[PDB]
Amino acid sequence: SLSQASADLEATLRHKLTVMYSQINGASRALDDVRNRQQDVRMTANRKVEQLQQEYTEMKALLDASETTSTRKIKEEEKRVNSKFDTIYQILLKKKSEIQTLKEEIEQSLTKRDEFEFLEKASKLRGISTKPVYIPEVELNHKLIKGIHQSTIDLKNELKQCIGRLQELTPSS
Amino acid sequence: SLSQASADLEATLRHKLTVMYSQINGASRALDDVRNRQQDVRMTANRKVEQLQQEYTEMKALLDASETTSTRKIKEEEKRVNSKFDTIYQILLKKKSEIQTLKEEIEQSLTKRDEFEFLEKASKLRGISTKPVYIPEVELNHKLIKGIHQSTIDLKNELKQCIGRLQELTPSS
Amino acid sequence: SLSQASADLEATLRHKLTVMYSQINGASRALDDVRNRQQDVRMTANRKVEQLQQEYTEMKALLDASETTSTRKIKEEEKRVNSKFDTIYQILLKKKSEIQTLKEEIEQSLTKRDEFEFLEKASKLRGISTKPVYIPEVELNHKLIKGIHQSTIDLKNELKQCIGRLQELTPSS
Amino acid sequence: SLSQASADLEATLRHKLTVMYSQINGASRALDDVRNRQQDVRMTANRKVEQLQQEYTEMKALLDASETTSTRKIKEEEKRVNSKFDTIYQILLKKKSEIQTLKEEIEQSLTKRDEFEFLEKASKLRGISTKPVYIPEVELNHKLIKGIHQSTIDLKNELKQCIGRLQELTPSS
Amino acid sequence: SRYLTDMTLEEMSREWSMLIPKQKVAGPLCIRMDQAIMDKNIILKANFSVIFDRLETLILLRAFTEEGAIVGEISPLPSLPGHTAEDVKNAVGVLIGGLEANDNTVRVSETLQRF
Amino acid sequence: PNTVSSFQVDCFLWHVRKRVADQELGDAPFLDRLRADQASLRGRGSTLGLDIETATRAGKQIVERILKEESDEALKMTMASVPASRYLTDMTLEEMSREWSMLIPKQKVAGPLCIRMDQAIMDKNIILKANFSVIFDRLETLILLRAFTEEGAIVGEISPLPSLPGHTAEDVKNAVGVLIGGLEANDNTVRVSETLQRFAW
Amino acid sequence: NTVSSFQVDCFLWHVRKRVADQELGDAPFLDRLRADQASLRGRGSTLGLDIETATRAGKQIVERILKEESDEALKMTMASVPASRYLTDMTLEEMSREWSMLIPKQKVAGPLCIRMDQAIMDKNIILKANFSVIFDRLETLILLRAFTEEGAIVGEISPLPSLPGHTAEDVKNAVGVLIGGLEANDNTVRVSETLQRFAW
Amino acid sequence: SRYLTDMTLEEMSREWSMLIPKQKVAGPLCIRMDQAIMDKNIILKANFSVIFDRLETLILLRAFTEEGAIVGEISPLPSLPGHTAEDVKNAVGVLIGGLEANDNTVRVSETLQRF
């Protein structure tokens, strides 16, 4: 009767061996499940981080555009005033060269001066005191460039305030 | 009458020579004046441009700070959920190891089976099915991270509106 | 007898009174002499300082002369290179103006088409690719101006060692 | 055949128009280049001139220092001899004041004359010939001050020799 | 490449027993069900991986009664974790037929319907 | 008992030190040292007879002047220091290029400058306008100065000599004194532009 | 931020040293110098923070405003290093020379036009440019060109005729794009010293 | 305008006595001499002020023997410091005659000879 109870408990222990096998398989499937869940949250986090980075790079490109546009406004205002000054320089130098030439001509007219035709040659030149030329004022647009500087400072301060409102929405550890 | 009028106009043209000397010197001073004025507006323009670039680089550094802070909030949320999952993995692997050990114990208990004490040796092991342990659910905070993404997009749109408000104040060439 | 010795000693003391004021008069003359000696050495010293200052102003005027001559050497070298550059500007602008004129001729010849004479008017224009102009290099004499600067610094250093040699001739307290 | 050759040379001349556009742009860039080269040599000349002016002003300041030092040595030698003379003045004035006091005292002792005790009052007042102190001669150090004058003249001639050696290296316009 | 989880970790690690076991090898999948469950509304929940818009690899599928009890299961063979979406579809059809033969009404989760 | 530069330095270094703990957190021993050095510098300013404000302004030009680079400096910000090399203009180009005439000429040679003035002008409020180059907080080289009446007429001119440029700032101050004296001797009221007041007195 | 103050104090001690280390300073001042030196060494030990690195950090933290300066001033300060020049790597002949690309590549990089001959391969190319410099920064470019080992022109960065001028970063971008387009054809690209000074 | 000093400070600040006094007012000057000095070589030294190349104001003149002894003196009256070079020259001639009449031999310093 003990050999039959031995076969009995061998059979019961083998069937519990089979239920143990099914439980170990379930545990391995649960391990795969937890691994895949953490892998999925990793993928979600990486995707959201790359979307964040593309948004911040877009903002950086808008700042680059604004910077180049403001610097182009300032360089063309500079070139405007500097080309007006260059043309004024050209006019003054042209007048100075004409007057310098006439002055030296009068200086080299005095070597043959006690010859009669000196009067005929020089009585015109006593009438010619051509010293004219009017120069209009050139003014750099100080209000515009000072306003560009003040307004870019304003842009920086309001961007600071915007980022503050953004970050205060969530807790920081 | 003509020799004395010749001396007269010689003297008048000689004083006219000195006034010409002084006016030509004045013209040279005005040329230096215009050159220095254009040099000054060049210096002013370059100074305002470098101040602009320094402000835009400060804004870029603020954007970098905001980006790093947002990505750190997202990685800390990721690491929270992933460490909860890691502890769950640890619990499941512990229970799996207990079951594996007991399975091998039954398998090598079936080798000394035809001794009476096999029943006494193995009737305990059919009874011990310690398979408990409760696992609470872990949930990634989707609303928080999608709200961070939505809010950074909103900050980008608000920077767009800000830069438009900035550039419309001044003319563009 | 005592009234007679009284008159006797009164008379001897009166003669000593006269010799005493004569010596005090000598003392007052010696005081006047010392005053005049002090004033005389004052006058001598002051005249020597005026001679020293006139010599030092002569030296300062020699320095002014050297300064003006060196600066004239630098300004005529400047104007030499700047007139060479002005002539180069003139040749390049003349070539640019020639090509601009021919370009306008080609641009306004190709707008009136479908005439037999269009071929006649533009077959001259296919041939003219006059694109030459040789520009010789202009080089500022940098060695000369940097040597003028180096040599004026050397002159300053040589004047320092001079005057250093001067003051060591006399003792210091 | 002429309409097709018209289209042929229209296309060839259009490509020639484009090459001319690029060459005229190159010409404008060369004009900017020569203008900027002239600007650079102007800046170089002005900078070297300001360095020259600063060196000559430093030399003038060294001359001022030497002048003040020489005049301080001369005034200190003057003050030496004049303070010796002041002490001599003090000694002579003290002796003159002693004799002046004695003179008034003896003049007011000969007013009490018909008393026998006048001798007792006045025999003390006789030979009070306060004639002390020997005064040594004071000599201004003439060799030193005339040597300072001679040596500053020598330094002027040595500055002449230096400036000549400087200017002879280069041609003068 | 994402992972879809109809079932919670508790539902995935929970143990269950069949009163009347029924097992079948459907290619590379093993199908188990309790033949004693009758006249119930059952919903199929599954945790599985997804690539592009298609099923890639199944981790586990389980059948839940209206009361939340497990009455069936589809799991890959340990020696054969590889398989296709079509094998899963056929296994689902076999399990649905087996459970409906006992007068059950079966519904499938939306993720399972899509894939 | 004179080498008290260390006080000026300490006054400068303390003030900036304040800034730190005065806005940011800094540190508690650091703030304690701030208070202690504050009291000690007050005691030293008492026993010295020297003001803290003035000694700090002296600390400015005694420190910020010999910061050379062992290693790579405070990138002395150009937003805050361009340096300050500029060219100031009180006069318009028209005012500059205008010609004028003196009824009673007075010409004087003040160093490297020529002063010219019309002595016939009397009992007028005159204003001085000049165009000149400025370096740091000092005048460097003068281009021209002129004297305008209340109505805008030219009555005086300080111009450098054509053959003898350039000159210093003190020469210009001397020429200004001489011109103002020559003009006010004729009962004239002389005012000066703000820039000229800034780099002339 | 309890460790900002250590950096601050290390910087202030360095500058403090300078004074008595060159000028006379003061004797109690020198005793405080040595004493604060030893104390900062002890604080650098107890902090677990190196004194050299924290001193460089005190430099770059006590140097980016509010250092130089506010408010005040008034005289007694300025802090700068001016400059205004025009640099030329190219001769007038090289500038005024004309060239032709067999395989033209033209790009619009901001306010600049980049042009290059794609047919050039396996050559050592050197970049020479004429440009205006202000302070230690590039100001405005007049022209840049690329010469071979033999001196032939193969590339050109020129500003647009209608749209002057531009910044320095536009020029650095154009330089990067040109170098990339040329080195993609197996070309070795070197740059002149002035350009390296005002581009890298 | 300079001051000439034939005599040292020591020589003038010394006392002397005349055995036979002889005094005379020569305009604005006082002449004193010892008529007991005979058969000596005498030198006249004087300290006086000089303007241009002429005498302006005399301070003191004294006669010295070969042995350095004072035997005569010329001094301005206290009430009359003002005087000319010619009155001084006349006083010098009077003093020379007074000392020479008693067989003295008198010499004059070069500075006194010039003025």
Numbering used by the authors:
A (entry chain A), B (entry chain V), C (entry chain I), D (entry chain N): 190 to 362
E (entry chain F), H (entry chain C): 87 to 201
F (entry chain E): 3 to 203
G (entry chain D): 4 to 203
What wording appears in the published article?
Activation of RIG-I initiates a signalling cascade that depends on the E3 ligase activity of TRIM25 and induces the production of IFNs and inflammatory cytokines. An example is non-structural protein 1 (NS1) of influenza A viruses (IAV), a multifunctional virulence factor that binds many host proteins during infection, including TRIM2527–29. To understand NS1-mediated inhibition of TRIM25 activity on a molecular level we have determined crystal structures of the CC domain of TRIM25 in complex with NS1-FL and the isolated ED, and of a TRIM25 CC-PRYSPRY fragment, which includes the RIG-I-recognition domain of TRIM25.
While our experiments established that the effector domain of NS1 is sufficient to form a stable complex with TRIM25, we wondered how the constraints imposed by the constitutively dimeric RBD within full-length NS1 might influence the architecture of the NS1/TRIM25 assembly. To gain insight into this arrangement we crystallised a complex between TRIM25-CC and the triple mutant NS1-FL (R38A/K41A/W187A) and solved the structure by molecular replacement at 4.26 Å resolution (R/Rfree = 0.27/0.31). Interestingly, the two NS1 monomers within the homodimer are not symmetrical; while both monomers align well on the NS1-RBD (RMSD of 0.6 Å), one NS1-ED is shifted towards the stem in relation to the other by ~17 Å. The relative arrangement of RBD and ED seen in this structure is different from previous structures of NS1-FL, supporting the model that the linker region acts as a flexible hinge to allow movement of the ED relative to the RBD to accommodate binding of different substrates. Structural superposition of the NS1-ED/TRIM25-CC complex with that of NS1-FL/TRIM25-CC shows that interface A, but not interface B, is present in the full-length complex (RMSD 0.7 Å), confirming its physiological relevance. However, dimerisation is unperturbed in both TRIM25/NS1 complexes and instead the dimeric CC is recognised by two NS1 effector domains at its distal ends in a symmetrical fashion. Furthermore, a key observation from the NS1-FL/TRIM25-CC structure is that although the overall architecture of the complex is identical to that of NS1-ED/TRIM25-CC, the two EDs of a given NS1 homodimer bridge two different TRIM25 dimers that are located in a perpendicular arrangement in the crystal. We hypothesise that this arrangement highlights the critical role of the constitutive NS1-RBD dimer in mediating higher order oligomerization of the NS1–TRIM25 complex, which is likely important for the proviral function of NS1.
